[PDB]
Design a protein around this ligand. Structure first.
Ligand SMILES: NC(=O)CC[C@H](NC(=O)[C@@H](N)CCC(N)=O)C(=O)O
Ligand SMILES: [Cl-]
Length: 513
């Protein structure tokens, strides 16, 4: 049986270590690779995966994983494995990211954005082979999110034998170009911006998928995606046009699943660029924007105007945080107070693809542009190919940039630290380039703290500190809609935002209306 998924854009590549977009993860880490541990689908409950069990030392600084035996690696034209998954695969996977003397560290540019943005290098002091089936992580300090971190895409396990061979053959880049995993699907063909083809991996260690061919039809226009869905040219699609939601609910070919998103959409201010280093200017740009008007016009009601980086469904949420008011007059006065009575010009980057937290960045940019103009700020809307967009914003080239997040592990650390820490400003996904000690003073002890109520207290104050400094314009938390042909059984919406096909089957017959 063949399932066709209409994806929203092209993946950036096939080694998940090197990238941060859900687009890439759906095409790489989710189908092809495994992690040591895995969340139960639809939840953030951690379950055994490549590690069948683990122990944690009483001081929390040592994690020992006992690895599943008999796990086969995939094969391709350049690689046939001579051994099964073991500790060396795990050690290669992490040392490549951590160690600049590992031969693969600079391969494909070595942009381990998650690894570096989460400060995993300062945390993980060693990864040790206890024996062929036992690996030990040694940490410099306790880290409550660490187990959840190992369930994330960036911590996918790559093949050390494959890596060995490709290095000896003088073509190490093939590890990143031609993926070899332990997972349920293997990559068969990729035609850039057109299609991805997968077949079920016969030697897969887990429960076999109920489909044996998986096709991604790369389809960036949401209206075209829905047209294909109605024709059953694809059976699943993400990010429907917000205007389409009403007739989709009446569409008897599909089940329209919906849930509150574990996500956020925002506009990052690059505080390295004038005049965005000025606090009153950031507050003025924030107060000029009517967020409720964006929820109405861009999301067509399907979300909530935001004051905090984390959505209401994330624990630690601080409801006592004080929203910036929509007040252009006062925003103009703040600019005057800042010594900018005649405003200024600034660029506003908007991605060209739909995101779970932003269904139409272009249209939203036009609204913010119109809002900013009322206070004398002239925004220039800029866009890039999705992969290039992320790369250049990571390089700090933007002045302001539209951005967002679906949580990866259910933990507040994965929002506050991964998006707004100093580590993330230097080498991660903090495109505000904001590095602020009183923030660090909260989010860093919060990771090390094991007491849940104490973690809640620290994150609540991190929201206060962040709101006071306005390093980003926090716009929305959005409703998630996932249209699925009724012929599809077994599909489960992921609050962590990836799309999983290893669990789905297709009915015998089909609806032709
Ligand atoms: N600027 C960035 O690196 C963020 C891009 C953003 N990524 C994510 O939200 C992560 N958490 C991947 C998880 C997911 N999308 O399912 C994106 O738009 O994909
Ligand atoms: Cl909020």
């Amino acid at each position: 049986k063949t399932l066709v998924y209409c994806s929203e854009g092209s993946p950036e590549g096939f080694n998940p270590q090197l990238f941060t977009s859900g687009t890439t993860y759906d095409a790489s880490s989710v189908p092809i690779y495994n992690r040591l541990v895995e969340f139960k689908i639809g939840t953030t409950e951690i379950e055994p995966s490549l590690a069948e069990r683990w122990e944690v030392s009483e001081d929390g600084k040592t994690y020992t994983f006992y690895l599943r035996k008999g796990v086969k690696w995939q094969d391709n034209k350049d690689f046939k494995p001579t051994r099964d998954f073991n500790a060396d695969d795990v050690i290669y996977s992490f040392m490549r990211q951590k160690d600049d003397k590992n031969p693969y560290h600079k391969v494909s540019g070595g942009s381990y954005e998650y690894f570096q943005g989460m400060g995993m290098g300062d945390l993980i002091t060693n990864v040790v082979k206890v024996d062929d089936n036992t690996v030990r992580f040694e940490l410099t300090r306790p880290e409550s999110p660490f187990l959840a971190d190992l369930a994330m895409d960036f911590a996918s396990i790559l093949s050390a034998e494959y890596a060995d061979n490709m290095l000896k053959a003088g073509t190490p880049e093939k590890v990143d170009l031609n993926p070899i995993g332990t997972g349920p699907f293997q990559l068969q063909q990729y035609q850039k911006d057109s299609r991805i083809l997968y077949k079920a991996f016969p030697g897969f260690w887990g429960t076999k998928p109920k489909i044996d061919r998986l096709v991604f039809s790369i389809t960036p226009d949401a209206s075209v995606r829905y047209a294909k869905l109605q024709k059953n040219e694809c059976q699943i699609m993400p990010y429907p046009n917000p205007a389409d939601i009403a007739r989709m609910k009446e569409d008897k070919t599909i089940n329209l699943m919906e849930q509150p998103g574990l996500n956020v959409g925002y506009l990052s201010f690059n505080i390295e660029k004038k005049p965005l280093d000025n606090l009153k200017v950031r507050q003025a740009l924030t107060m000029a924007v009517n967020k409720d008007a964006i929820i109405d016009a861009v999301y067509q009601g399907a979300g909530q105007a935001a004051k905090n980086l984390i959505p209401p469904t994330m624990w630690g949420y601080n409801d006592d945080v004080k929203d910036y008011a929509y007040d252009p007059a006062k925003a103009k006065e703040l600019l005057k107070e800042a010594g900018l009575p005649d405003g200024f010009s600034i660029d506003l980057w908007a991605m060209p693809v739909q995101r779970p937290y932003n269904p139409n960045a272009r249209r939203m940019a036009e609204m913010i542009q119109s809002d900013w103009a009322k206070i004398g700020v002239k925004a220039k809307i800029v866009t890039y190919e999705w992969g290039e967009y992320l790369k250049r914003a990571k390089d700090g080239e933007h002045e302001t940039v539209m951005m967002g997040w679906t949580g990866d592990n259910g933990d507040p650390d994965n929002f506050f630290a991964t998006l707004f820490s100093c580590d993330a400003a230097k080498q991660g996904s903090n495109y505000s380039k904001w590095c602020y000690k009183p923030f660090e003073d909260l989010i860093q002890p919060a990771r090390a703290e094991a007491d849940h109520d104490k973690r809640v207290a620290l994150y609540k104050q991190a929201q206060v500190v962040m709101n006071e400094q306005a390093p980003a314009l926090i716009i929305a938390h959005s409703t998630v809609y996932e249209p699925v042909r009724k012929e599809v059984k077994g599909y489960v919406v992921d609050p962590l935002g990836k799309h999983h096909f290893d669990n789905v089957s297709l009915d015998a017959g089909e609806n032709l209306y």
